[PDB]
Amino acid sequence: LQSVGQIVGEVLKQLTEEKFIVKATNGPRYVVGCRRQLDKSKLKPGTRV
């Protein structure tokens, strides 16, 4: 119950390893970072996250 929704989006691109340009799948673009064990390598342009 406490558990919770998670926004969706495609990676527009990877600014830095952790810095990302992602257009919200439900709207505008944002500068954001990764998590950790997500695989900064996998994160790639147009990848839905």
Partner 1 sequence: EFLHAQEEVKRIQSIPLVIGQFLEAVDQNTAIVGSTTGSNYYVRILSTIDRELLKPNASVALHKHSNALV
Partner 2 sequence: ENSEKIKVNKTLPYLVSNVIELLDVKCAVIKTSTRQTYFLPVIGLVDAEKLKP
Partner 3 sequence: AEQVYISSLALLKMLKHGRAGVPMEVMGLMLGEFVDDYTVRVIDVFAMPQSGTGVSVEAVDPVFQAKMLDMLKQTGRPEMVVGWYHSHPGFGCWLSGVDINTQQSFEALSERAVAVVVDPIQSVKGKVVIDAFRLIQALIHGLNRHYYSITINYRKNELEQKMLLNLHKKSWMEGLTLQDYSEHCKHNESVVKEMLELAKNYNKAVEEEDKMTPEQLAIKNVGKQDPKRHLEEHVDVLMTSNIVQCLAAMLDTVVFK
Q: Which residues bind partner 2 (CB under 8 A)?
A: 1, 3-8, 25-26
Please report how close the Cβ of residue 13 comes to partner 1 at its closest, in angstroms: 10
Please report how close the Cβ of residue 3 comes to partner 1 at its closest, in angstroms: 21
Per CB under 8 A, the segment of 6-14, 19-27, 32-40, 41-49 that binds partner 3 is 32-40
- Tell me the CA distances in angstroms from 23 to 1, 2, 16, 49, one per residue in order: 28, 27, 16, 10
Rg of the chain in Å (alpha carbons): 11
Geometric angle at alpha carbon 8, from 37 and 41, rounded to 5°:
30
Q: Which residues of the shown chain bind partner 3 in the complex (CB under 8 A)? A: 2-3, 33, 35-36
